[PDB]
Design a binder for this molecule. Structure first.
Ligand SMILES: C=C(C)[C@H]1CN[C@H](C(=O)O)[C@H]1CC(=O)O
Ligand SMILES: C=C(C)[C@H]1CN[C@H](C(=O)O)[C@H]1CC(=O)O
Ligand SMILES: [Zn+2]
Ligand SMILES: [Zn+2]
Ligand SMILES: [Zn+2]
Ligand SMILES: [Zn+2]
Lengths: 258, 258
């Protein structure tokens, strides 16, 4: 049985190869998660097909219908066998899908245009001149909506009611708004993407302050799927043999532009 | 049924309170893991007894008999229900017991006596006037034995053969040895422990370099135990509410002596 893998286009995790239109199947793609997928499959002994998630989303649960969208949904509704992506391990997801132990550590972080007078979340919350927001339908937004810590709740209260919207649809959309906003927009996003963008031309953004929380990405499978045990052991083996650090270097730093 | 918890005396995870001899049961102890346990029991709704592991070990498998010792053994052989301790999630353990998602991140790091001329593992591996070692029967020693990375493999050869032994039975033993070696012993240990000790009188040690690897501590239960699911969901909730972060501030930095 060819394992159906859901994933999403997000640099440097999964990206289209330059000559993708001349290539077929799995060969169309490259990146951290493409390399990780090849290694998981070889170590667990399965054949697989990478498929980009149809709605371009990670997965949130619609309040009204309570239907799950994105990669989480593809797993919940039986459309995919496994998701290999920068999918954040969270409580509400773990209630509907299974995760491996994390293959990468991260935290929510602040991205500014260089020179923006902000050094922390506390700084953002006590001022109004510089706008700030997060991605829609992700763990970052849910972290702010749920948090009971004063600084973060105060930030949430601001963001939910800010007009125009401070929320963006895609990482690229948030980074353009930082760049294009002359220092008047700050972007809350995971440290891993922040670090990657900081190493890319035009070299005008930077991560400031410490991370706001601490969590991980995991490989997800449908609840009670039998693939989960093998996949979990593989991730731990690969971490032990240093493959995950090798890959992070390859995709983030070995070719940093800054 | 009262849940039996195996743990181990290791600062600042589990320590006897100054007035323990006046106190009874779970009240004799305090620390990060003591607070963590009360939180897990509360959210999973259970009553528990904290018991210090008889042999004072975390857990490794005897090569001849294949028998597991320490906290891992207590779980495997049916003597405890759960382990709450700085127990490293590793491949070999995950084969015989279950772990929650990590409640704390860490890496292998180098502890030196302030002033020692060492900046990295490379630096250790390329000289021999400074001795260095690790704890017996833990995940750090196994890391160096199993490591196919040139530098880490190189150190392993030196360490296994060295005489006298560069290995230690306890964290305290390693730390003392550093402190009295007048700079000619460096100790390889987990970053969490390193950081804690750095903030304690007589403030003569420091962590140097970045971490050699990235891993996590997890709460362990016997394979296929029912407690596993709730405990896991409980670790994610606590992390999400910032409690794990509050606890680490409480126990590492809030009362630092340096
Ligand atoms: C890039 C997308 C929106 C994903 C990536 N990890 C989080 C997800 O697993 O929800 C999202 C990041 C964001 O929430 O800051
Ligand atoms: C302090 C003890 C021996 C433990 C704690 N974590 C690892 C354990 O879970 O194996 C060990 C540290 C390391 O081996 O340096
Ligand atoms: Zn294209
Ligand atoms: Zn391999
Ligand atoms: Zn006593
Ligand atoms: Zn609580």
């Amino acid at each position: 049985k060819t394992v159906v893998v859901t994933t999403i286009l997000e640099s440097p995790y999964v990206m289209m190869k330059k000559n993708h239109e001349m290539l077929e199947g799995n060969e169309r793609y490259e990146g951290y998660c493409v390399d990780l997928a090849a290694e998981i499959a070889k170590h667990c002994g399965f054949k697989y097909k990478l498929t980009i998630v149809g709605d371009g989303k990670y997965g949130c649960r619609d309040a009204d219908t309570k239907i799950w969208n994105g990669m989480v949904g593809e797993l919940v509704y039986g459309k995919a066998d496994i998701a290999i992506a920068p999918l954040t391990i969270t409580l509400v997801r773990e209630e509907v899908i299974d995760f491996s132990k994390p293959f990468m550590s991260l935290g929510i972080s602040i991205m500014i245009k260089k020179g923006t007078p902000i050094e922390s979340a506390e700084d953002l919350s006590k001022q109004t001149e510089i706008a700030y927001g997060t991605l829609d339908c992700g763990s970052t937004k849910e972290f702010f909506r749920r948090s009971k810590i004063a600084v973060f709740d105060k930030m949430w209260t601001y963001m939910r009611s800010a007009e125009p919207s401070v929320f963006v649809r895609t990482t690229a959309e948030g980074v353009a708004r930082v760049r294009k906003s002359k220092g008047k927009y700050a972007y809350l996003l995971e440290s891993t993407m922040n670090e990657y963008i900081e190493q890319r031309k035009p070299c005008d953004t930077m991560k400031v302050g410490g991370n706001l929380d601490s969590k991980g990405y995991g490989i997800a499978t449908p609840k009670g799927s039998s693939l989960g045990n093998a996949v979990n052991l593989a991730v731990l083996k690969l971490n032990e043999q240093g493959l995950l650090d090798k890959l992070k270097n390859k995709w983030w730093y070995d070719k940093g532009e800054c």
